[PDB]
């Protein structure tokens with residue numbers, strides 16, 4: 001009976017945890033009990049960076065990560081998380097399946113012991129705040145929490161806000177005590193973490209589309225039978241259809257839910273946000289020496 005360990009920052013009640021639990025149940029049923037999955041939610045093992053490292057080193061078997069998070073180690077991958085470059089999940093999937101994406105996935109495998117089995121949709125990030133964001137000019141000086149992620153910081157900085165990086169587990173208390181003014185996350189996350197309880201405004205900035213790769217350590221993969229490999233691949237893809245459809249459905253009806261909770265929802269013009277990102281797209285292309293932003297944006 002193989003027990004695999006899977007870690008996530010998301011908490012019980014999140015879509016990420018619910019999909020992991022559906023995956024664990026699917027694995028146990030398709031395997032007649034031979035594959036079990038122990039879940040370690042709420043970032044008890046660290047953040048996604050720390051968990052990815054645990055897959056590399058061998059003490060964690062599965063975890064979640066965005067394709068663009070690979071840029072911490074594989075700098076060209078960062079481009080897929082630059083603000084406003086990926087237009088929706090299908091676009092991000094084209095990047096993931098392209099020759100470019102295959103090359104990143106091959107480097108993930110051969111250098112970092114990361115096998116990407118699939119990538120699911122985890123939502124488009126939006127911006128909450130303790131005062132309305134009606135246009136980019138409102139961002140000036142906003143103390144906007146961001147994760148420890150350069151592109152989220154750049155979104156905040158180039159919009160004129162003051163980025164404050166801090167771990168996900170600390171965000172609610174930081175909003176409640178008004179140590180920060182706002183944060184940015186997909187709508188299902190805002191709902192599950194109850195950030196709408198401590199934020200009066202939500203701005204549809206659509207600034208970064210998050211996918212969610214399901215990654216298994218290659219050292220664990222090569223110790224599984226090829227039958228178990230096939231069960232896991234099939235289970236991940238089936239659960240991934242449910243996860244992606246659930247996120248899509250929830251992102252839609254959550255605007256109605258937040259309004260019913262008294263949240264002020266704004267729809268700022270996004271063209272000024274894209275224009276504000278131009279010095280970032282040029283820095284990135286010039287630093288890497290090739291027009292990566294340009295062709296990713298056209299894929």
Ligand SMILES: CC(=O)N[C@H]1[C@H]([C@H](O)[C@H](O)CO)O[C@](O)(C(=O)O)C[C@@H]1O
Pocket residue numbers: 008009010047048064065066068069146147148149167168184185189210
């Ligand atoms: C797989 C994973 O851990 N995703 C986490 C992401 C990424 O760390 C970030 O987008 C950089 O890729 O940050 C969050 O949205 C956040 O802290 O607000 C929590 C989310 O659970």
